[PDB]
Design a binder for this molecule. Sequence first.
Ligand SMILES: O=C(O)[C@@H](O)c1ccccc1
Ligand SMILES: O=C(O)[C@@H](O)c1ccccc1
Ligand SMILES: O=C(O)[C@@H](O)c1ccccc1
Ligand SMILES: O=C(O)[C@@H](O)c1ccccc1
Ligand SMILES: O=C(O)[C@H](O)c1ccccc1
Ligand SMILES: O=C(O)[C@H](O)c1ccccc1
Ligand SMILES: O=C(O)[C@H](O)c1ccccc1
Ligand SMILES: O=C(O)[C@H](O)c1ccccc1
Ligand SMILES: [Mg+2]
Ligand SMILES: [Mg+2]
Ligand SMILES: [Mg+2]
Ligand SMILES: [Mg+2]
Lengths: 357, 357, 357, 357
Amino acid sequence: EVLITGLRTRAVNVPLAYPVHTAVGTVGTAPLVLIDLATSAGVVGHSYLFAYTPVALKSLKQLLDDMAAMIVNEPLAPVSLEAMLAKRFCLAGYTGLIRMAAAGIDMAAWDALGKVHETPLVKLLGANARPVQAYDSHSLDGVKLATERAVTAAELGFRAVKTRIGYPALDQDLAVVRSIRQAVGDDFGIMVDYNQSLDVPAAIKRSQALQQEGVTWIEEPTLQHDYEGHQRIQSKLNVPVQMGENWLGPEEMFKALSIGACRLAMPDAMKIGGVTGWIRASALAQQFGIPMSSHLFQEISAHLLAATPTAHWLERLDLAGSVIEPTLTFEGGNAVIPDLPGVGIIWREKEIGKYLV
Amino acid sequence: EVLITGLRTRAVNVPLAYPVHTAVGTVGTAPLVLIDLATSAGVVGHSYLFAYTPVALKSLKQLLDDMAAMIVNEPLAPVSLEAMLAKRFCLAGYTGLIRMAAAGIDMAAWDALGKVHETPLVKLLGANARPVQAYDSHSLDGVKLATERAVTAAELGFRAVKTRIGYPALDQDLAVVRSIRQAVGDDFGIMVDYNQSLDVPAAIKRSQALQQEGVTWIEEPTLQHDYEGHQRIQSKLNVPVQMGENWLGPEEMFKALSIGACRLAMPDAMKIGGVTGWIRASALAQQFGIPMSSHLFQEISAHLLAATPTAHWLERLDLAGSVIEPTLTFEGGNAVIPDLPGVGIIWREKEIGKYLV
Amino acid sequence: EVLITGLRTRAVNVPLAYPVHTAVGTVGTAPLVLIDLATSAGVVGHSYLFAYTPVALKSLKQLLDDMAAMIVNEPLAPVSLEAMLAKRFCLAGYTGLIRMAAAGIDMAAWDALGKVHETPLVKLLGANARPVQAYDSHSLDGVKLATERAVTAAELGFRAVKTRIGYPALDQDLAVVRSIRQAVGDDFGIMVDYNQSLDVPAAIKRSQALQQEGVTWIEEPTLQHDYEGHQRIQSKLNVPVQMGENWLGPEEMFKALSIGACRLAMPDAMKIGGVTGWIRASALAQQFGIPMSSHLFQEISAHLLAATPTAHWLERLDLAGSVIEPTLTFEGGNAVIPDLPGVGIIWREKEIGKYLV
Amino acid sequence: EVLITGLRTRAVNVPLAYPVHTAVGTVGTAPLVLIDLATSAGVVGHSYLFAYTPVALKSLKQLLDDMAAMIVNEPLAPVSLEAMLAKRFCLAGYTGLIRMAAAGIDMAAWDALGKVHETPLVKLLGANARPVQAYDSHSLDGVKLATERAVTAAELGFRAVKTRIGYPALDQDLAVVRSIRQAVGDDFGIMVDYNQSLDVPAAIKRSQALQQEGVTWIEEPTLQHDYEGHQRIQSKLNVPVQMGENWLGPEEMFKALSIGACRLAMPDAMKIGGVTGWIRASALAQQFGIPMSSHLFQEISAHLLAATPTAHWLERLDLAGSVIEPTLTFEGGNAVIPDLPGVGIIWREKEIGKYLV
Ligand SMILES: O=C(O)[C@@H](O)c1ccccc1
Ligand SMILES: O=C(O)[C@@H](O)c1ccccc1
Ligand SMILES: O=C(O)[C@@H](O)c1ccccc1
Ligand SMILES: O=C(O)[C@@H](O)c1ccccc1
Ligand SMILES: O=C(O)[C@H](O)c1ccccc1
Ligand SMILES: O=C(O)[C@H](O)c1ccccc1
Ligand SMILES: O=C(O)[C@H](O)c1ccccc1
Ligand SMILES: O=C(O)[C@H](O)c1ccccc1
Ligand SMILES: [Mg+2]
Ligand SMILES: [Mg+2]
Ligand SMILES: [Mg+2]
Ligand SMILES: [Mg+2]
């Protein structure tokens, strides 16, 4: 009955509202691939993929264009499509870029499904829309800018910020945390992200000093793939260890949870396998007793978390704002699902034209 | 937008096409509760619950009638409804009869959801309909009747039968298995169910003799709740141990899988928590590497298994055939989802009137 | 020789001396089922069941009335009766409402046994009566009422109170604990109950702050069924974790103890399987090294704990006081078994008439 | 001193000497990317990457072309280069296509290193060249062709063949194994590959029947990423379980070995991280006590295995034969390293021109 009839992809480099500071330098643009999934019913599903670095952007788009042939003419049934792709790529390696690509199709396919039934994605998954608490995600900004950005966030109504740390000296990490605290008061959440930059012993030492400061969570303290090493750092902390943005598929999350690597999880809608992967990851999180937050893709995450038993926080990081209408709104620090079928992503065609690669 | 506006329940005692023989005696009827879930959209969701024994039938219906007040006027959103009930019953004990009842509402609620969107349940879950291999489930029938019933099943096209064993002597269990084999040939599957009737040492002994015969699986050899004891029996077998019909909620299945109690799982749609519980159990089965079959509720299971990554077998045991139209058909030993919105359950009002309790 | 000859049940809604405050609102009545077990010897055993919510009350009574047929004419031998019921319900699910019902019959059957031999239950179990320290159990009462109620308890001679916590902010939980402490002095015990309301990370954080305050125990911090999650919270505390009120049968307690979920146990006489289940649970507690307290059913618990090797505290929460004579007395904060055959439960027929449902 | 000065890549689709039969159909060509790594010393390193499917070929080449900018002007020091890339891709995901690409550069970089020092790679790694036993790798060929191909292999001097199995029926897998055996005699090795096509229970059953036949190893019986599931199948076999062709980096091999997933390993030079990854994987294999064989890349594997303490077999599967000179020779079933600097890969420029994509 409803068939997929085409796939069109466009690679852009969009400006970021909040340039992200890093050890290297400032990055003011995001490399995205926009996807349009056409169907025999006259509706188009939409989604986007984040490439992380301009180095992979063209390659990601080419991969997607080359896979269009496997999905054109298949029924618009995301669970069954996902099983087919996992089988086609079983030798090449259903992970990395290939898995991300497939996740792109899944999210667009679900968006079209919601449109066929004229219903918001959240409702198609069987849950009600509810606002989700969100925190504003900042970067490796230095004491002054980090403080400045936190003050603005509280001004906009957020009740928590995420800062990135990992300066050369521990003393610099703490300066930043303290300056934020002083300007925002003691209620306020302050999440901190190490972005995989420390070895285990250094992680235990810096984390215990931070725990004494009062942070909400300690995220990705060491190499993302070393589960066992995250479990060792967690074993010496009261504050929770957060991770999950880099799990490629729920079978990687299962491995890390099976070992006790962390006390909080934050899957990335794209890497986790789209809507289909997320539903799976949510069942796991529920059973292991782990609060689950999101990483990027704020548009679809708002819907995904509402249907997530252990939902915890939504990460506000607006990558695609320049090319999409602002249908997701934040009120009182909570993300509010818009009442539009699918995920509610609507392109600003005019602008996309400017950033085309 | 779509609200639940009423709940009506009717308790019946229906005749069984295949009287089930047991150690005690023959049972020719099934105690069911039919549920009708009305909604503000003009559609009615339907489902049924199996009470196992007439002893619990009135109590089950009374429980459901008494909970109608908590769900009337709530939005028709099964995932969110399920979370609310788990919270209302957190002190009483969200398990047993209460959990079964809630599972009744979930299945009816999902059936209504499929009707609101005029789509079969399988498609609403995001998968395509596909036929599912099914095996015909018989009872503790003795050599002659068990053989007879197997021959008929193969005549009707099935390619596997389940017999119940656990006679006073092992030698009787084997007589039955061998007589079936001789009449159906070596290709044919022969599943055997102990229904929790042996202690661990007796299970290891009888199972190893059966493994030598050639059975497809060994199901519930000891008390259902002794996970660790199932893991011990499994540790000495090549043939797989099957179980799962008695898990109340995916959190019980999680416990048994975490320990390696079995190599096959067969959740019961009602005890597992309905459609919402099943989706959860399917994610777990996928990650632990376990083929997953169904227990009873053949109507909705056909749809559920099509959306189940590790689907394995559908259990044909027609409890409600006397009061429902035969929309599910078996062709070539495979169950075929009917193309009707929801689950495809349509009452035979006329007959229900006869079996009313 | 002594046979069971009848079962009569009456469902009531009794007033509580101490209205229990909850997040939802105040509850001033308890839904109970009273049971009378008649015997061929001319004696009647008595017991009661607590239904938790009015939603389950009629269903519980109907279940009991429907099972009377299986026990009428059986010998008055509680251990053998319990084995028979566990076998009749092996498919339906010997847990939840069914298990509670069976536990009702067990307690009444033991009460009749004590009456046949004209001896208090404690003595029939082979132990001497001894007073048991008891603590007064209060609710989610707020700083003012919680303090008030604690002061009264100390006035009545108790040397410990249980308060329920789990306010929206940790700071509210602590305010309450501190206000109580200030009014009762530092000797005094202060137990706190979370009633399953926190996720694991939140439990570790709030518990460590409370441990610093000085509480006696931290009870049910997270979902009752997540044993592994209780073990994680316990692993980061010095103060003990308490739980057990929700174990359905000693086979659930065995599972939680096998994993180290807690350092204290407090089985509920009804859910644990009656007198027969308790004796079993007491043997387990002894071997795992766990002090064992009671949950509700103060009348029979006084007798049960005297025969319990690791007995610890008796929970004073008078559910049935309105319809039973006050034969159990508290003197000097210790419950005192009355010297009457059986459990010493004697109905106030007059009043029961008022609360009948 | 020696700098990398350029990277040129060419995507080809080469004919295979031995068309590979699969469940789907016959594939007569291999999608490869050839890499030329230029250096300031006047030497060019060469290597190739296998893309598995034409779907990923253009994307792989584009990725490599886009990363050339990060390596141009860096010193020709493969260990240090590899650390730099692992750090650049730490957010995107250093695995999948990105990891394969980086592995392409590593192998070419090592080939150039051997050329700068005018020495064969094996000698630069500190070991002597020695012949390595090799087995001829065939496909899902059916009884007749599989037998035919085995007979030819023995004619050419090989003393072992690998066949792929996984037919719809176990009986078909065995027919093939037996027919081969009959034509090659009992000495001969017969390896069998399931290519991830069975679930765990089906793997245990089919493997035990094969073990009875007499195979050398059972390779990839279930999903490659389910380590724990491979460990379960291995636990019921005497014959060893082989796997490793799909490990992306030694950190995935470490995970599988840490759990006992298999008794033999066979890393793939490209997926394992090139020469730098292999040296690492060889140290692990040595310590866990596992014989280590190769998967594809026969040219460089011959050198790699000579420096590998637990070396076991070399897999003969000639993907690039159409575009490279035949410097690697097989004599007496043993691969013989050629005496040429680097890996000994020399392009047939003329032909490459024909297969260019
Ligand atoms: O958690 C986060 O937001 C960061 O780790 C992050 C990683 C990659 C891109 C942007 C942001
Ligand atoms: O697996 C099965 O079918 C049996 O265990 C079974 C149990 C309860 C009712 C009917 C059938
Ligand atoms: O431990 C306790 O007393 C509470 O958890 C409690 C639970 C249920 C009913 C009353 C009281
Ligand atoms: O081990 C082997 O050779 C096979 O698994 C194989 C896999 C992928 C490509 C070619 C061959
Ligand atoms: O530093 C990072 O977070 C990363 O490189 C990044 C983040 C957001 C946009 C572009 C690039
Ligand atoms: O023996 C059984 O399977 C069980 O008691 C039963 C099965 C089917 C219908 C009624 C009762
Ligand atoms: O909140 C509770 O403790 C529970 O709902 C309750 C307790 C005591 C009587 C009635 C109900
Ligand atoms: O079936 C396979 O082995 C795989 O798809 C393949 C192998 C060799 C060349 C091309 C493709
Ligand atoms: Mg992060
Ligand atoms: Mg069964
Ligand atoms: Mg309590
Ligand atoms: Mg292979």
